Amino acid sequence: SGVTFQ
Amino acid sequence: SGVTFQ
Amino acid sequence: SGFRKMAFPSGKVEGCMVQVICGTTTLNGLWLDDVVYCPRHVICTSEDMFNPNYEDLLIRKSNHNFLVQAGNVQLRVIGHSMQNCVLKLKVDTANPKTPKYKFVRIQPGQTFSVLACYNGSPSGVYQCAMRPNFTIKGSFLNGSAGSVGFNIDYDCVSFCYMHHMELPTGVHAGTDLEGNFYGPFVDRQTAQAAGTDTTITVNVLAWLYAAVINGDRWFLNRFTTTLNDFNLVAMKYNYEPLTQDHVDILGPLSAQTGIAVLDMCASLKELLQNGMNGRTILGSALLEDEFTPFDVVRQCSGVTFQ
Amino acid sequence: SGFRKMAFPSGKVEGCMVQVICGTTTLNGLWLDDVVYCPRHVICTSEDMFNPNYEDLLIRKSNHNFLVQAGNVQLRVIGHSMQNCVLKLKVDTANPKTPKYKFVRIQPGQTFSVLACYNGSPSGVYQCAMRPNFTIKGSFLNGSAGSVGFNIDYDCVSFCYMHHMELPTGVHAGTDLEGNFYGPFVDRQTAQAAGTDTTITVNVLAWLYAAVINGDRWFLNRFTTTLNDFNLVAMKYNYEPLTQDHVDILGPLSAQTGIAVLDMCASLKELLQNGMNGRTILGSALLEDEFTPFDVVRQCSGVTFQ
């Protein structure tokens, strides 16, 4: 699980 | 049943 | 990621909405260049809507009977005519906010954004589809006639719907921007039969592709069906027939996901026959049919406008 | 009649959207008066997003490192600062399209319209809610950060969300327009626990009132429950507690339909315990919780804006 910058 | 103008 | 019922940005249309008052009737008009388009029943009276004779009603009007308000400025009507079920009110001022635009008459199954308006002022925006029975499942109150439906491509607004009236089942009927009704309806306050509606098969398939793109895969299977065999199932569940043209339109989504169209048809058959078994697809427990293949590509690829 | 997921008209916000480029990173900014607001991770590099030190990264930038494009005109950046997780880029030109606006930090359960943008250009508009776990179930791709969420009241745009990032479950996280995240999230590309979400009870009740207003009544019953007894059922089904303030907020819809709030709570309890038995409510087979009481009144009464 990793947050992804958009 | 009746059509209603809007 | 994510998949939402997505409307087009409405600003280009907002700048075209005006108020039209005739007698005691208020509704909306669409102001493009020096013409305001609006539903012709604005010229009716309360006791003459069972079968109005619109040619007579319009002969009895003058330019000054039409009050047109654009925000805080009143526009002077300098001419009026009838085209099918819309009125064209020529005004002495061209709309300085007129976008690049076209008028299009859409096919059943195509979607569009609605800018719902009252008193010439925008209230909200939502997406809907032309149903196979040529009604739309809108959200419309008295005074909303003249609200328009549209699509945008780059900088060009394609107007495809102008709202007129509500059927007793609570669904909606209206015209193209030339004033031709969608479906068999006429602008009379009478009982009017709407066809039995059906589900838009190619759109359901598009939305199943959107689900796959977004990581919902539980409904996929190893089977493939034939077009003829699938259409037998579609007819049993009140789904529209799938044509080869539909299969070709689904080409891009099939190529991106690697799932052949007839492979996804086998999933849809299983869903129709066995249901969802308590699961959901893109947040829905029903099979959604108001996204076109283009809608899916548009939203999953980030297409913008002008 | 009808009830749709309805967004606010987006034109006032469209005129505020710009493109911000720093290095090889492109996202959107919000241009109000002579300031452009955008997510601060625009100043990150590809190998330094596990734990960027934003103070260092910003000290190393100059005004000319920020390219700001408003349609076809480039804006000159004449100052830059950081406020929490947003950047404020002062430009030499005030936005001539700046609407009346406010910045608001919303509570969980409140809804807003999102204008999804890429390269400073609007792509589409949709409605969503601040979830109880402070995520939003949006539709966002790479490049959409800086898109904003908003509500409108008359002529005033209340901005409440600026998009930053996507969690591994496919839901979205972002800030108020002062740069404070909603929820526990931080702008790091790390594993971050989202709370278990719950269903927004007061909104489900609002939507059941919308159903009644629209003629769906099959779920009504003659029973009334107590607040305490209903909240026992809510907790079992992962619904938020209903407070007396919620009961008071539902006042207008209760008065219009003549159905007391605790009477509608008895319907909701039955729906939770027994399901829908193959029926639908406003076209949905699930209980919908992203309409507030105000959303229902807004759409069922035809409120317009400026």
Three-state SS sequence of chain D: CCCCCCECCCHHHHCCEEEEEECCEEEEEEEECCEEEEEHHHHCCCCCCCCCCHHHHHHCCCHHHEEEEECCEEECEEEEEEECCEEEEEECCCCCCCCEEEECCCCCCCEEEEEEEECCEEEEEEEEECCCCCCECCCCCCCCCCCEEEEEECCEEEEEEEEEEECCCCCEEEECCCCCECCCCCCCCCCCCCCCCCECHHHHHHHHHHHHHCCCCCCCCCCCCCHHHHHHHHHHCCECCCCHHHHHHCHHHHHHHCCCHHHHHHHHHHHHHHCCCCCCECCECCCCCCCCHHHHHHHHHCCCCC
Domain endpoint, select from D175, D192, D209: D175
D12 touches chain C (CB under 8 A): yes
φ, ψ dihedrals at C251, nearest 5°:
-50, -60
What resolution in Å is listed for this PDB structure? 1.7
CB contact under 8 A, C190 and B3: yes
In 3D space, the residue among C271, C239, C267, C237 whose CA is nearest the CA of residue C254 turns out to be C267
DSSP bridge pairs for C128: C112
CB contact under 8 A, C140 and B6: yes
Same domain, C125 and C156: yes
C119 touches chain D (CB under 8 A): yes
Chain B contact set for C173 (CB, 8 A)? 3
Please tell me the distance from the alpha carbon of residue C303 to that of residue C155, in angstroms, as a whole number. 12
DSSP bridge pairs for C136: C172
Contact call for residues D87 and D42 (beta carbons, < 8 A): yes
Q: How far B3 CA sits from the closest chain C CA (Å)? A: 5
Q: Which residue has the tokens 């030109």?
A: D93
Chain A and chain B touch, per 3+ beta carbon pairs within 8 A: no
Q: How far D143 CA sits from the closest chain C CA (Å)? A: 9
- C4 found inside a domain: no
Instruction: Specify the 3-state DSSP secondary structure of C166.
Output: strand
CB contact under 8 A, B3 and C140: no
Please tell me the distance from the alpha carbon of residue C254 to that of residue D173, in angstroms, as a whole number. 31
- D180 found inside a domain: no
The CATH number of the domain holding residue D266 is: 1.10.1840.10
Chain D contact set for A1 (CB, 8 A)? 167-168, 191
Same domain, C211 and C266: yes
Please tell me the distance from the alpha carbon of residue C263 to that of residue C203, in angstroms, as a whole number. 16
Same domain, C245 and C214: yes
Query: In whole angstroms, how far apart are CA C170 and each of C113, C150, C194?
Result: 19, 21, 11
Please tell me the distance from the alpha carbon of residue C144 to that of residue C129, in angstroms, as a whole number. 18
Same domain, D226 and D287: yes
Same domain, C279 and C236: yes
Instruction: Specify the 3-state DSSP secondary structure of C127.
Output: strand
- D280 found inside a domain: yes
Query: What angle, 0 to 180 degrees and rounded to 10, lies between the N-to-C axes of helices D227-236 and D261-274?
Result: 30
Please tell me the distance from the alpha carbon of residue D167 to that of residue C2, in angstroms, as a whole number. 11
Q: Which two tokens stand for residue C129?
A: 């589809």
Strand C156-166 versus strand C100-103 pairing type? parallel
- C190 found inside a domain: no
Question: Technique behind this structure?
Answer: X-ray
Contact call for residues D268 and D207 (beta carbons, < 8 A): no
Same domain, D109 and D167: yes
C52 touches chain B (CB under 8 A): no
CB contact under 8 A, C145 and B1: no
φ, ψ dihedrals at C121, nearest 5°:
-115, 130
Residue C18 structural domain:
13-91
Q: Residue C80: count other Cβ atoms within 10 Å of its Cβ.
A: 18
* Amino acid type, C135: T
- C181 found inside a domain: no
DSSP bridge pairs for C151: C158
**Chain C 224-283, residues with CB within 8 Å of chain D CB atoms:** 280, 283
Same domain, D168 and D218: no
The CATH number of the domain holding residue C38 is: 2.40.10.10
Q: Which residue of A has its CA nearest to D162?
A: A6
Contact call for residues D148 and D159 (beta carbons, < 8 A): yes
Q: How many domains does chain D have?
A: 3
Please tell me the distance from the alpha carbon of residue C127 to that of residue C103, in angstroms, as a whole number. 18
Q: How far D226 CA sits from the closest chain C CA (Å)? A: 30
**Chain D 157-176, residues with CB within 8 Å of chain C CB atoms:** 166, 170-172
Contact call for residues C68 and C75 (beta carbons, < 8 A): yes
Q: How far B4 CA sits from the closest chain C CA (Å)? A: 5
Helix (H) or strand (E) holding C291: none
Query: What angle, 0 to 180 degrees and rounded to 10, lies between the N-to-C axes of helices C227-236 and C261-274?
Result: 30
CB contact under 8 A, C124 and D298: yes
CB contact under 8 A, A5 and D140: no
Domain endpoint, select from D69, D91, D113: D91
The three-state DSSP-derived secondary structure of D77-131 is EEEEEEECCEEEEEECCCCCCCCEEEECCCCCCCEEEEEEEECCEEEEEEEEECC
Cα Rg of chain A (Å, integer): 6
- D304 found inside a domain: no
C192 touches chain B (CB under 8 A): yes
- D183 found inside a domain: no
Give Cβ neighbours of residue D96 (< 8 Å, ≥ 6 apart).
none
φ, ψ dihedrals at C102, nearest 5°:
-140, 160
Q: What are the start-end ranges of the H helices in chain C?
A: 11-14, 54-59, 201-213, 227-236, 244-249, 251-257, 261-274, 293-301
Q: Which two tokens stand for residue C281?
A: 């697809």
Same domain, D81 and D125: no
Please tell me the distance from the alpha carbon of residue C206 to that of residue C48, in angstroms, as a whole number. 45
- Sign, CA dihedral C233-C238-C239-C241, equals positive
Contact call for residues D209 and D253 (beta carbons, < 8 A): yes
Please tell me the distance from the alpha carbon of residue D239 to that of residue D241, in angstroms, as a whole number. 6
Label residue C129 exposed, middle or buried (CB < 10 Å: 0-12, 13-18, 19+): buried
Q: How far D139 CA sits from the closest chain C CA (Å)? A: 4
Query: In whole angstroms, how far apart are CA C230 and each of C144, C219, C265, C289, D126?
Result: 41, 16, 7, 17, 34
Domain endpoint, select from C140, C175, C210: C175
Same domain, D48 and D104: no
- C186 found inside a domain: no
Same domain, D273 and D217: yes
Same domain, C79 and C119: no
DSSP bridge pairs for D101: D157
**Chain D 78-107, residues with CB within 8 Å of chain A CB atoms:** none
Q: Residue D104: count other Cβ atoms within 10 Å of its Cβ.
A: 16
